[PDB]
UniProtKB/TrEMBL annotation:
This is DUF721 domain-containing protein. The chain holds residues 24 to 104 of 288 of the full protein. It comes from Deinococcus radiodurans (strain ATCC 13939 / DSM 20539 / JCM 16871 / CCUG 27074 / LMG 4051 / NBRC 15346 / NCIMB 9279 / VKM B-1422 / R1).
Length: 81
C-alpha cells in the first residue's frame, strides 16, 4: 500500500498546482481515498461553481499525477460551522 500512499499524498499536494494560486488560497484538499478527492471550500456558492466545472480541475490534477496515479472523482465540501 506504499505506492497507494505515494499517490494519495501526491493528489493532495498537487491540488494547488492544478488549480492555480487564486483558487488554491480559498480551498483545501482534505482527503483522498477510494479514488475520490474531497476538497473543502469556504461556502456553498463556491462549492457549486467548483462542482459545475470540476472535470476541468480533475483533468489538470490527473495530468500532474501522471498515468496510473489518477484520481477518479473530485468532490467539494463545506463545513457546517
Amino acid at each position: 500500500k506504499l505506492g497507494y500512499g505515494v499517490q494519495r499524498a501526491r493528489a493532495l499536494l498537487l491540488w494547488p498546482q492544478a488549480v492555480g494560486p487564486e483558487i488554491a488560497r480559498m480551498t483545501r484538499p482534505r482527503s483522498v481515498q477510494g479514488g475520490t478527492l474531497f476538497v473543502e471550500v469556504r461556502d456553498s456558492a463556491a462549492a457549486h461553481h467548483l462542482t459545475m466545472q470540476r472535470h476541468h480541475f480533475l483533468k489538470r490534477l490527473n495530468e500532474l499525477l501522471g498515468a496510473g496515479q489518477e484520481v477518479s472523482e473530485l468532490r467539494f465540501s463545506v463545513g457546517h460551522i
